[PDB]
Amino acid sequence: MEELTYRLFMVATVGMLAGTVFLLASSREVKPEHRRGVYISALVCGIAWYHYQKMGASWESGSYDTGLRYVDWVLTVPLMFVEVLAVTRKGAAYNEAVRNWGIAATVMIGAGYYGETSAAGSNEYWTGFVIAMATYVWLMRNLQAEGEGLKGDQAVAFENIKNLILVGWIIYPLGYIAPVVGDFDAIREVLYTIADIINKVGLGVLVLQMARVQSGEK
Numbered sequence: 001m002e003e004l005t006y007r008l009f010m011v012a013t014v015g016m017l018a019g020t021v022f023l024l025a026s027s028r029e030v031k032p033e034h035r036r037g038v039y040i041s042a043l044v045c046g047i048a049w050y051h052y053q054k055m056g057a058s059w060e061s062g063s064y065d066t067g068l069r070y071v072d073w074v075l076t077v078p079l080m081f082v083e084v085l086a087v088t089r090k091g092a093a094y095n096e097a098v099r100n101w102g103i104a105a106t107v108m109i110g111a112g113y114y115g116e117t118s119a120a121g122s123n124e125y126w127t128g129f130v131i132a133m134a135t136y137v138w139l140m141r142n143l144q145a146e147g148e149g150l151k152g153d154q155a156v157a158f159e160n161i162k163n164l165i166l167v168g169w170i171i172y173p174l175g176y177i178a179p180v181v182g183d184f185d186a187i188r189e190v191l192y193t194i195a196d197i198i199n200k201v202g203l204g205v206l207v208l209q210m211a212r213v214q215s216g217e218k
């Protein structure tokens with residue numbers, strides 16, 4: 001598990017870079033008025049690229065620092081919400097939702113870090129997990145409510161974005177509780193790595209697909 005975790009860290013490092021530069025290269029395929037989301041998606045992968053280089057070295061040393069992961073989450077998760085809420089809102093409704101979902105994500109990740117840096121299985125470990133779960137469900141319930149009246153190609157493209165978050169973000173609570181299911185300290189970092197790749201690269205690809213539809217492409 002130890003060597004597999006190191007290899008996945010190094011592979012995800014290059015995958016985040018590949019996601020960053022591919023998304024920058026693909027921005028020419030859509031109209032200029034829909035390139036902002038492609039650029040923000042590349043920045044998300046670019047930030048994760050910077051932190052996955054550190055996480056890979058941190059894991060290789062033997063003294064792993066999950067703070068590198070959580071500081072990447074607390075920066076990138078609100079950024080990923082910026083373009084999701086843009087599809088359905090603008091003006092005051094947008095700024096409110098962006099602010100509120102960003103506060104919720106920060107509490108979720110902060111509570112998770114409080115619990116993950118506690119003793120595994122302790123009351124603090126569970127306190128962080130329960131608080132993070134409740135804010136997570138609040139975020140997912142809000143997300144499902146977004147884009148209710150949409151129809152056509154834009155609705156299907158937005159539903160793919162929504163379902164990627166609704167399904168792909170479940171990997172994180174499973175990773176957090178993997179250390180108390182078995183001798184699976186490294187499996188937690190395996191699941192965190194796979195989820196970041198699926199959710200960061202995958203969202204960027206879907207946002208790119210949303211920009212193609214908005215550009216009138218079939």
Ligand SMILES: *C/C=C(C)/C=C/C=C(C)/C=C/C1=C(C)CCCC1(C)C
Pocket residue numbers: 072073076077108109111112113128129132133136169172173176196199200
């Ligand atoms: C780019 C990184 C991504 C999208 C981060 C997502 C992280 C969360 C959805 C994780 C939340 C957690 C829980 C729901 C319960 C246990 C603690 C956390 C922080 C792992």
Ligand SMILES: CCCCCCCC/C=C\CCCCCCCC(=O)O
Pocket residue numbers: 020024039040042043046047048049050
């Ligand atoms: C805690 C420190 C965070 C460091 C973040 C480092 C991430 C930099 C990586 C490359 C970003 C490139 C993404 C492209 C930016 C948008 C494209 C554009 O503006 O035209």
Ligand SMILES: CCCCCCCC/C=C\CCCCCCCC(=O)O
Pocket residue numbers: 067068070071074106107109110111113114128131
């Ligand atoms: C229990 C409720 C917690 C409320 C959290 C409030 C805001 C927390 C903000 C984000 C913290 C996550 C980032 C911390 C990791 C860095 C630590 C380190 O590098 O040593």
